Structure formats: structure tokens, C-alpha cells
Amino acid sequence: TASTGFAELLKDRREQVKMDHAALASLLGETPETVAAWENGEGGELTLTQLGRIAHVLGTSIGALTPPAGNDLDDGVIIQMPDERPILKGVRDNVDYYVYNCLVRTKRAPSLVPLVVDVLTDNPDDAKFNSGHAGNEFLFVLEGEIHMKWGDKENPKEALLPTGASMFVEEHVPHAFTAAKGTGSAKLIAVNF
Amino acid sequence: TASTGFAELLKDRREQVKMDHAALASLLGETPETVAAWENGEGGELTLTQLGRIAHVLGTSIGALTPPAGNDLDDGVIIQMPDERPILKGVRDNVDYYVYNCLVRTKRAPSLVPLVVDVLTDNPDDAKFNSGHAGNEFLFVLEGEIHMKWGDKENPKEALLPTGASMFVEEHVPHAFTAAKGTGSAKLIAVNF
Amino acid sequence: TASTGFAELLKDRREQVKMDHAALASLLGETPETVAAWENGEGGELTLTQLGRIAHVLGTSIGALTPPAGNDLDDGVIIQMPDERPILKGVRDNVDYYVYNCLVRTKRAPSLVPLVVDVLTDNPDDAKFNSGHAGNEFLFVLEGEIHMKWGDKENPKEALLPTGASMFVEEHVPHAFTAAKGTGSAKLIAVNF
Amino acid sequence: TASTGFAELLKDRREQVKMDHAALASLLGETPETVAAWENGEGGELTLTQLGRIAHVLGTSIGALTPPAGNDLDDGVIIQMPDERPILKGVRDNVDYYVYNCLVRTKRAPSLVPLVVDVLTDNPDDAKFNSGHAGNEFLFVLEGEIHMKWGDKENPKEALLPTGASMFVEEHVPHAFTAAKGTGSAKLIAVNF
Ligand SMILES: CC[C@@H](O)P(=O)(O)O
Ligand SMILES: CC[C@@H](O)P(=O)(O)O
Ligand SMILES: CC[C@@H](O)P(=O)(O)O
Ligand SMILES: CC[C@@H](O)P(=O)(O)O
Ligand SMILES: [Fe+2]
Ligand SMILES: [Fe+2]
Ligand SMILES: [Fe+2]
Numbered sequence: 001t002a003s004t005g006f007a008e009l010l011k012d013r014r015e016q017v018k019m020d021h022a023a024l025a026s027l028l029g030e031t032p033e034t035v036a037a038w039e040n041g042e043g044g045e046l047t048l049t050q051l052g053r054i055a056h057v058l059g060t061s062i063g064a065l066t067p068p069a070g071n072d073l074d075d076g077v078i079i080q081m082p083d084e085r086p087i088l089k090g091v092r093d094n095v096d097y098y099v100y101n102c103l104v105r106t107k108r109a110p111s112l113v114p115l116v117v118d119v120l121t122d123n124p125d126d127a128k129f130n131s132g133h134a135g136n137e138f139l140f141v142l143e144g145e146i147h148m149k150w151g152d153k154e155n156p157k158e159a160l161l162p163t164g165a166s167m168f169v170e171e172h173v174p175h176a177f178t179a180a181k182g183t184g185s186a187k188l189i190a191v192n193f
Numbered sequence: 194t195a196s197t198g199f200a201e202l203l204k205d206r207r208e209q210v211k212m213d214h215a216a217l218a219s220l221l222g223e224t225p226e227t228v229a230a231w232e233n234g235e236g237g238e239l240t241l242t243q244l245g246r247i248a249h250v251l252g253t254s255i256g257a258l259t260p261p262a263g264n265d266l267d268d269g270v271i272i273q274m275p276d277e278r279p280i281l282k283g284v285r286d287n288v289d290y291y292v293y294n295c296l297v298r299t300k301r302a303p304s305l306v307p308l309v310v311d312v313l314t315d316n317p318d319d320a321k322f323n324s325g326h327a328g329n330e331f332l333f334v335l336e337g338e339i340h341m342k343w344g345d346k347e348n349p350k351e352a353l354l355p356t357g358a359s360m361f362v363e364e365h366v367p368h369a370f371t372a373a374k375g376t377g378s379a380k381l382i383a384v385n386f
Numbered sequence: 387t388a389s390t391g392f393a394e395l396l397k398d399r400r401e402q403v404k405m406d407h408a409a410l411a412s413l414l415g416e417t418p419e420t421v422a423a424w425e426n427g428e429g430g431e432l433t434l435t436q437l438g439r440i441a442h443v444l445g446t447s448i449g450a451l452t453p454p455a456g457n458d459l460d461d462g463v464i465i466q467m468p469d470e471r472p473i474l475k476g477v478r479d480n481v482d483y484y485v486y487n488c489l490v491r492t493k494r495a496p497s498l499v500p501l502v503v504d505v506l507t508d509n510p511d512d513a514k515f516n517s518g519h520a521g522n523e524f525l526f527v528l529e530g531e532i533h534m535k536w537g538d539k540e541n542p543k544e545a546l547l548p549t550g551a552s553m554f555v556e557e558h559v560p561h562a563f564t565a566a567k568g569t570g571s572a573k574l575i576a577v578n579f
Numbered sequence: 580t581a582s583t584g585f586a587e588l589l590k591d592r593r594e595q596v597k598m599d600h601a602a603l604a605s606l607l608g609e610t611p612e613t614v615a616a617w618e619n620g621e622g623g624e625l626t627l628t629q630l631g632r633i634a635h636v637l638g639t640s641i642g643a644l645t646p647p648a649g650n651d652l653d654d655g656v657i658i659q660m661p662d663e664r665p666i667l668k669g670v671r672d673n674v675d676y677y678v679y680n681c682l683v684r685t686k687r688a689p690s691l692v693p694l695v696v697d698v699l700t701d702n703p704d705d706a707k708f709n710s711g712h713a714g715n716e717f718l719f720v721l722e723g724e725i726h727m728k729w730g731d732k733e734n735p736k737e738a739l740l741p742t743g744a745s746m747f748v749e750e751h752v753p754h755a756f757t758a759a760k761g762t763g764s765a766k767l768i769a770v771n772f
């Protein structure tokens with residue numbers, strides 16, 4: 001819980017920089033009771049800006065004071081059935097470019113975002129890039145032929161990938177996909193980790 | 194600024210898990226406008242518990258959604274004059290055990306907590322342990338003789354350290370210090386990193 | 387190159403601990419020239435055990451002294467065509483349990499090991515566990531029905547997963563797969579990251 | 580031990596990328612026995628360049644295949660008496676600029692390099708910079724007055740620090756020290772972490 005994780009972590013950091021309730025309360029313009037209450041799980045209503053200050057006087061970040069994502073696994077694993085996948089339709093330049101079928105995710109590995117992607121367009125000339133993004137990405141061509149584009153949107157490198165091909169795109173590298181010219185559509189599994 | 198860092202990071206995570214304002218608003222029981230406002234630096238008054246939920250539906254931590262500690266350096270460095278050091282008097286079992294003179298700290302390395310410590314007691318038999326702590330610690334005997342105790346409080350290892358000696362205590366390892374028997378007091382520099 | 391990375395990193399560490407060619411040569415029982423030669427890319431023939439000692443006197447690891455995996459990407463990406471996938475047949479208890487079709491890998495993310503796995507057996511009762519392993523694993527059922535087993539081999543949790551289902555198994559968690567009882571075989575994509 | 584750590588780690592990586600002795604031996608131009616021997620602690624005489632290749636075919640680094648620095652602590656701590664400190668005399672432009680008295684170091688925190696530094700010169704005009712370096716640095720003025728210079732060697736920022744002052748210099752930031760003009764010499768404790 002936000003409150004408890006904060007309550008425990010706040011007390012940790014405070015002690016770490018050798019401050020008592022009194023000393024910390026003083027730098028924040030609060031009373032010793034207030035601080036003590038926080039360390040007792042009563043910080044729940046603290047605003048983001050307020051958390052910002054507490055973190056500041058303690059010369060650290062809000063992150064260092066809040067608990068980890070939390071656990072959502074069942075004895076080590078988490079499962080997702082095909083019919084419970086969130087479906088988000090991606091739009092680029094008012095066109096239906098992609099369709100994101102979101103696969104299993106877990107708070108134990110927040111950076112893991114697996115997807116089954118429906119590549120809707122089939123005109124390489126109309127390919128639309130993203131500005132690259134954080135985290136690496138593993139790709140597997142699930143169906144059809146994928147026409148891949150990466151690098152500089154103005155003068156990019158290309159590759160026509162057949163069903164079963166696998167790629168890796170490093171973080172920050174810009175990319176774009178479309179079905180092979182005229183083939184209608186294609187599908188690929190995209191795994192961000 | 195808490196609000197802006199959050200505003201930027203929220204939009205990052207939302208997009209990362211392929212959600213639009215609508216989709217996210219729905220899982221949270223909020224309106225699309227609200228979410229949009231947040232991504233626009235208006236999340237300042239969000240409570241800790243509320244931040245807890247947003248982090249939860251986005252399968253991540255509050256930390257991943259809040260900005261880093263921030264920068265407080267002057268072209269790479271930060272300086273502290275001897276007369277501006279915070280002074281906290283540590284008490285163990287109602288006795289004045291230590292006196293913490295806090296040295297320079299920086300939000301760029303929150304785990305760095307340097308101290309000039311006044312070891313007040315000089316009776317090894319009355320040594321008082323801490324339950325060990327996170328982070329390693331480098332020590333340098335600034336003055337007098339330090340009588341060091343570490344490990345198991347019931348049956349610990351010991352060492353009489355002269356002025357100029359240097360030690361390293363791994364994280365979680367319990368320790369205690371006092372001036373060499375009868376010598377009155379001693380001083381050591383303690384650096385937690 | 388091993389030699390150059392080592393040559394550059396050795397000089398870094400040596401300076402870091404304030405040692406000159408003379409000082410380092412002395413602790414190792416070598417001549418100043420020898421050390422200088424190493425820092426000049428001539429360490430190529432140094433044995434593992436010898437590297438072990440150099441690392442030791444420099445109070446660090448061989449890893450800290452050798453260069454990173456290296457880059458093997460083409461402007462950010464690496465591609466693998468379906469016909470160039472390595473094929474390793476996994477055997478457990480003298481039976482053909484799995485068939486590993488290895489997908490694209492990259493020295494820029496060594497922990498990334500994607501696979502198309504052929505689940506050969508279809509008798510849950512004959513399921514064979516692994517002792518769990520380092521790194522998390524994302525799974526997607528490519529075909530048929532997969533009968534999953536994880537946790538304690540003696541009394542494990544189970545799940546019958548249909549085509550299109552996706553799972554996540556945390557690191558160190560033991561697991562086993564087989565095709566749904568009697569269905570012959572199944573295929574799943576396994577991504578270790 | 581280099582050999583054993585390598586023997587264990589090699590087997591780990593090999594299995595991780597689904598290769599048997601045969602498969603790995605083949606990519607390296609070795610026999611299955613050879614590889615098996617390595618995994619059995621007999622890799623001791625492998626040269627750096629050879630380790631370089633093994634790492635390469637296994638799409639990773641030598642570091643990932645060699646063991647960590649190792650442990651050198653005595654129940655959590657390591658101690659150094661003042662008379663056993665290594666003494667290195669630093670020279671910049673053929674002048675005796677510094678004198679490094681090396682304090683306790685540990686393979687459990689290789690980046691920790693604490694020093695008692697004798698600042699020999701006392702002419703700010705003759706201050707000599709370093710090109711900055713990896714890792715942050717905590718400083719404490721042990722004696723006299725230190726004249727500090729950091730940033731751009733051509734047009735740097737300055738500070739006259741009295742005994743007891745403490746500073747922090749971020750990694751890569753260039754710096755230089757000398758005793759306050761005419762005061763002869765000064766001493767400071769420098770802790771790289
Ligand atoms: C397959 C498309 C994904 O990689 P994107 O979210 O557009 O970067
Ligand atoms: C010198 C005293 C420190 O080691 P402490 O914060 O009491 O563990
Ligand atoms: C699908 C089987 C893999 O997860 P394994 O290499 O046996 O752990
Ligand atoms: C006190 C001198 C150190 O900061 P250096 O190793 O010369 O950068
Ligand atoms: Fe992407
Ligand atoms: Fe301590
Ligand atoms: Fe596995």
C-alpha cells in the first residue's frame with residue numbers, strides 16, 4: 001500500500017540522514033506529530049507537490065520514498081487468456097495504422113509490454129514512423145510479409161520480412177511497419193522489455 | 194517539479210502500455226479530461242493513495258511515474274562550509290552515545306551520507322549496536338582510539354583502531370563504536386554510500 | 387577487441403587506485419615494461435588465471451577489466467530470416483521433450499533469448515521440470531493447447547492454455563510444458579529477457 | 580577461482596542459448612571434449628583473445644563469463660592500520676603535486692577508493708587539472724586551506740575551502756587542488772565511490 005510503503009521508507013531515509021521527527025518537521029514547516037503520523041501510515045492524503053518537498057529536504061526522490069510496483073503473480077506466474085486482451089487502435093495521421101492486442105503484463109517487470117500487432121496498411125510509401133522509444137523491442141512476424149523501416153525517416157534502411165522472421169530494434173531507434181506492398185495486412189508479435 | 198515530472202512520465206507510461214486518455218480514464222473511474230489535465234501538469238493535488246492506484250492500473254510503481262531527485266550542483270560540484278553542518282545528537286538507551294555532524298549531501302547521489310561523528314562514550318562494555326543498515330559504509334578514525342564492535346551483538350568481533358585507521362562495514366552488518374577504554378572520547382569520519 | 391578493451395580498462399583501473407606501472411608491476415611480480423605492454427594491447431595471450439590475479443591485486447573483477455559484449459546491430463537493428471534459425475533438440479530423461487528454434491539474438495542485449503519451441507510430448511503425467519532459471523520469461527501459445535506446470539514439481543499448480551494465451555514466469559520459478567493431453571503436439575514462443 | 584567461475588558461468592550461458600557441447604564446439608572450431616573440459620575448470624590457460632571469441636560466439640561479454648571480484652571481508656568488515664597504507668607520489672608536469680596515501684579498499688565495492696591526499700603545491704596559478712574521471716568523489720579538508728578549481732581549465736570556477744569543509748565533485752567534472760596561496764601545504768580526504 002502507498003501509505004505503508006511510504007511510512008516505512010520515510011522512516012528509513014530520515015534515519016539514514018540522521019534526522020529525528022523534530023529535525024525533519026522543522027525543515028518542512030510541520031510539527032513533529034505530523035511527521036510521526038506519516039511514518040505511521042497516515043500520509044495517504046499527501047499531495048504530489050508535498051511529496052515533492054519531503055523528497056527534496058531529504059535530498060532524494062519521491063521514488064526512493066514510495067514502495068515498488070507490488071506483486072501480482074500466482075506462485076511465480078501470471079496468465080492471460082486470448083479473450084481478455086485489451087484492444088487499442090493506434091492512429092497515425094488520421095489513418096488506422098495499427099491495432100494493439102495487449103498480452104500479459106506484470107508489476108514484477110513493468111518494462112515488459114508484449115503485443116500482437118495488426119499491421120493494417122500495405123503501402124510502404126505511406127509508412128509512418130514513431131520517434132523511437134525507451135527500451136529494446138523483440139519482434140516476430142506472425143503472418144504475411146512485413147515491410148520494415150528504421151533509422152532516419154527521410155532516408156531509412158529497409159527490409160522485407162517473411163512470416164517467421166525475427167528482429168530486434170534497439171531503444172531510441174525509430175521504426176515503422178506496413179504489410180508487404182499490396183498484400184493487404186500482416187501480423188507481428190512485438191515484445192518491449 | 195513534481196507536477197511536470199509526473200505529467201511527462203504519466204504520458205510516457207500510458208503510451209507504453211498502449212492506452213489513450215479514454216482507456217486510462219476508464220480503468221481509474223475518471224473522465225478523459227481529468228487524465229489529460231494530469232498530463233498537463235495539473236496533478237499537483239493528487240494524494241499518495243491516488244497516485245498509488247494510477248501506478249497500479251498502469252502496472253508499475255509511483256517511483257516510475259515521479260521524476261528523479263533533481264539537480265542541486267553548481268557546474269558539477271556542491272560545497273559545505275564547516276559552520277553550516279547540521280548537528281544531530283544520537284541517543285541510545287537514554288545516553289548521549291554519538292553526535293552527528295552532517296557533511297555535504299547531494300540529490301545527485303542520495304545514498305551519499307558523509308558524517309563527522311563524535312564518539313562520546315568510552316566504555317566498550319556499554320557499547321550499543323544498531324541493527325545494521327542498507328548501504329556500505331567507509332570509516333576513518335579522525336581522532337583518539339576507536340573500539341569497534343561488529344557482527345552478533347551477543348558474541349561480536351572486536352578491533353581497537355588507532356587514529357588514521359580506515360575500515361569498511363558491509364551493508365546489513367551490525368556495528369558499534371566507543372572510544373578506547375578510559376580515553377574519554379574519539380572522532381571518526383563516516384561515509385555512507 | 388579483447389586486447390584493446392583490456393588495454394584501455396586496465397589503465398583506467400590502475401590509475402583509479404593510484405598505481406603507476408612500477409607499483410602494479412611490483413604487486414604482480416612482473417616488470418614495468420610488461421604492464422606497459424598490456425596497456426598497449428599486448429595482453430592477448432594472458433591466461434584466465436593470470437587475468438584472475440591482475441583483477442585481484444586491483445581489487446576488482448575480470449569483468450570490470452574486459453570490454454562489453456560489443457555491437458552487432460545495423461543502424462539499430464538486427465534481423466533473422468526463418469531459415470537461419472539454429473535448431474537444438476532438448477532431451478529430458480532420454481525423450482525428445484522440446485525442439486528449440488532459436489530466434490534473433492544481439493550482443494547489445496545478451497539476456498535476450500527468444501525461441502519458437504516445439505512441445506513434443508502430450509502426456510501431462512510425463513511432464514518434466516527444469517530447476518527454474520535466471521531471467522524472466524514471456525510466453526505466447528503459438529499453436530495447439532499447452533498444459534502448463536509450475537512451482538513445486540511434487541505438488542505444482544497447473545493451467546491448460548489455448549492458442550493465443552500469454553504467460554509470464556518469474557526468474558527461478560520452475561516450470562514444464564506439454565501439449566494438452568492426447569492432442570499430439572503444441573508450439574509456443576518463449577522469450578527470455 | 581577464475582577457472583571455476585568461468586567453468587560454471589560458461590555452462591550457464593551455453594545452456595541459456597540452447598547449445599550443447601557439440602553445437603558450441605562447432606562454432607568455435609574446437610572438439611566437444613575441449614568445451615566439456617572448460618566447463619570442468621580446465622579453462623585456466625585460455626588466452627584473453629580466446630576468451631574474447633568464446634564470448635563472441637555466445638553473443639555476450641567476457642565479463643558475463645568470468646566470476647565477480649570475490650570476497651575479502653572478515654564477517655562483513657575489512658580494516659586497515661595507518662602504517663600499511665600504500666604511498667604513491669603523483670606527478671604532474673614534473674612537479675610533486677600530490678602524495679596519495681591509500682586507505683582500505685574491498686573487492687566487494689571495487690569502485691570505492693578512499694585516500695588521504697597531501698596537497699604539496701601552494702600556488703593556485705600553478706594548479707594542474709585532471710581530465711575529470713569516472714565515479715563521484717566526496718572530499719573533506721583534513722588540514723590547512725585548500726584552493727579548489729573545477730570545470731573548464733581555461734576559465735574555471737574556484738573556492739577557498741577551510742579545514743573541515745566538505746565537497747562533492749560529480750563524475751567527469753575536471754578538478755584541481757593546491758594549498759591556499761603561500762600556506763605551504765594542505766591535506767584532504769578524498770573518497771571515490
Ligand atoms: C510494431 C509497432 C511497435 O513497435 P510501436 O509501438 O509503433 O513502436
Ligand atoms: C559511526 C556510527 C555509524 O556507523 P551509525 O549510523 O551509528 O551505524
Ligand atoms: C518453453 C520451455 C522453456 O521455458 P525452458 O528452456 O525449458 O525453461
Ligand atoms: C584530491 C585529488 C583527487 O581529486 P585526483 O585523483 O587528483 O582527481
Ligand atoms: Fe516500437
Ligand atoms: Fe553505520
Ligand atoms: Fe524457461
Ligand SMILES: [Fe+2]
Pocket residue numbers: 712716754
Ligand atoms: Fe578526483
